[PDB]
Amino acid sequence: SVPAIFLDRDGTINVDHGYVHEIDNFEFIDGVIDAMRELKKMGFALVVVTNQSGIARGKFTEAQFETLTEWMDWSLADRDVDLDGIYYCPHHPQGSVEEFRQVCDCRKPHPGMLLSARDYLHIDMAASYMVGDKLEDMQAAVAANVGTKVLVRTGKPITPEAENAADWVLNSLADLPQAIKK
Numbered sequence: 244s245v246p247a248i249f250l251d252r253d254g255t256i257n258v259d260h261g262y263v264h265e266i267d268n269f270e271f272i273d274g275v276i277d278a279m280r281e282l283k284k285m286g287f288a289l290v291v292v293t294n295q296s297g298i299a300r301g302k303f304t305e306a307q308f309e310t311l312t313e314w315m316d317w318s319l320a321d322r323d324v325d326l327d328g329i330y331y332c333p334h335h336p337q338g339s340v341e342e343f344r345q346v347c348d349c350r351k352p353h354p355g356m357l358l359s360a361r362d363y364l365h366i367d368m369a370a371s372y373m374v375g376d377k378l379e380d381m382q383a384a385v386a387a388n389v390g391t392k393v394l395v396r397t398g399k400p401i402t403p404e405a406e407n408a409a410d411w412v413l414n415s416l417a418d419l420p421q422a423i424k425k
């Protein structure tokens with residue numbers, strides 16, 4: 244099998260401005276591209292797992308999300324960071340867009356995306372890490388049996404509940420490689 248770093252996006256990889264769907268509003272957090280490179284060098288698979296309820300809300304389309312994700316995927320690959328999987332949940336139970344309106348198994352804190360990635364890539368879960376800025380990230384990880392749950396300070400002023408559920412709290416994903424090496 245392979246160990247993985249599971250990655251939230253908004254608040255973790257990019258600055259969370261709310262329903263980010265435009266290239267011109269996608270801002271990589273300082274140091275995270277370099278950190279992801281290092282994580283790849285240290286033998287981790289990298290898997291994005293992102294809730295994208297803006298699709299169900301009609302803030303933007305799945306077409307627009309794919310355009311952005313393609314761009315993000317190239318941008319990283321061009322910086323020697325080759326993502327192993329990108330999983331997203333377009334769903335919301337109250338979605339205005341019928342196609343995406345539903346309770347689902349993939350919306351964090353449900354561990355669905357992490358389980359799919361596990362089965363696809365043959366991921367060693369106990370040897371893996373989840374990194375996110377929200378409670379829902381930590382809860383998805385515990386459910387999927389992710390060995391280490393890492394909260395970051397780059398998004399939402401963290402809640403006590405999110406901090407409670409996390410194993411580690413780091414300022415940024417940029418700090419992860421050094422934390423793992425230590």
Ligand SMILES: [Ca+2]
Nearest residue numbers: 251253254376
């Ligand atoms: Ca987030």
Ligand SMILES: [Zn+2]
Nearest residue numbers: 332334347349
């Ligand atoms: Zn879903």
